[PDB]
Amino acid sequence: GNAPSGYLMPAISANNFCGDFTTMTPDYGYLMPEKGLFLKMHDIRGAYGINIYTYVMDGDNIQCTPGHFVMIVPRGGDKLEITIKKSSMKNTPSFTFIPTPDCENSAYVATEKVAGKYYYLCGDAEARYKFEDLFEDERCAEFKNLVDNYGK
């Protein structure tokens, strides 16, 4: 009913690509219908930057509005630094994700470019596993609690 879903998020210059999406370096997405949140994660040398968007549906389209940004930075001795910032509406992109009816290898594509490219949402189990492992990591309570308590 409200099970969350994970996505790989390659960025491609064309908005109508259908082929092998794994030739591109992906970000990761996580849709949480139980909370009305969409998370987008970017990896920089093992540190994670996660945007928490709020979303609503517009028919089949997922409309995503910036919320907060969580940074998770590994440090010596298996420590993590977790920090949270409010995202700016002016400086963090919004997304509208629309279906890809003609491509079975993607679930959605963005309506607008970011840095010249379209992000796709490609359904993916491993992306889901990555988020769910991070939520439940004993060191990540600050992140889990932000998400669990969000808007509430």
Binding positions for Ca ion, rule: CB under 5 A: 100, 103
Closest approach, Cβ 57 to Ca ion, in A, equals: 17
119 with 9: CB under 8 angstroms? yes
Nearer to Ca ion, 82 or 103 (CB): 103
Closest approach, Cβ 12 to Ca ion, in A, equals: 14
Closest approach, Cβ 132 to Ca ion, in A, equals: 24
89 vs 15, 28, 37, 92, 120, CA distance in Å?
24, 21, 16, 6, 21
Nearer to Ca ion, 92 or 100 (CB): 100
Nearer to Ca ion, 48 or 120 (CB): 120
Closest approach, Cβ 112 to Ca ion, in A, equals: 19
Element counts in the chain: helices (H) and strands (E): 2, 10
Distance CA 59, CA 102 (A): 18
Nearer to Ca ion, 12 or 71 (CB): 12
Chain centroid to CA 18: how far?
Answer: 21
146 with 52: CB under 8 angstroms? yes
